[PDB]
């Protein structure tokens, strides 16, 4: 029923992870942005380094790509598969670019659609 951003993001990030995409970390996410292979950016909050977040806003703005501002980067690490080991490990991933469409070539779920619906307004 309800598919708010904070629950469709997990679905879209996972579904991308099965089908490549998901450029994790500031490096290679900046590469996806400059190379213009990106379709969605997920910047995490509570990032101490101001230059980090400011530069990723700059990249997204100039490249005209949507930007999601989630909190608790560790949760982003869970979502993008950085955790592994059941539910242990958990490195922070405070930025991620969803290459080859917001969704992936495997499936086109409506959870992808809610993202663009929320971004249109």
């Amino acid at each position: 029923g309800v598919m708010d951003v904070n629950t469709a993001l997990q679905e879209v990030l996972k579904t991308a992870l099965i089908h490549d995409g998901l450029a994790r970390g500031i490096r290679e996410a900046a590469k996806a942005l400059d190379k213009r292979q990106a379709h969605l950016c997920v910047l995490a909050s509570n990032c101490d380094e101001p230059m980090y977040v400011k530069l990723v806003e700059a990249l997204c703005a100039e490249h005209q790509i949507n930007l999601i501002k989630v909190d608790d980067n560790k949760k982003l690490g869970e979502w993008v598969g950085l955790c592994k080991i059941d539910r242990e490990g958990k490195p922070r991933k405070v930025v991620g670019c969803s290459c080859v469409v917001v969704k992936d070539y495997g499936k086109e779920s409506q959870a992808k659609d809610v993202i663009e619906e929320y971004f249109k307004c």
């Binding site: 500031i26 900046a30 230059m51 400011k54 530069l55």
Partner: peptide, 9 residues
């Protein structure tokens, strides 16, 4: 990091 590469600022 790769801060020294890009310069928004």
């Amino acid at each position: 990091l790769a801060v020294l590469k890009y310069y928004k600022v």
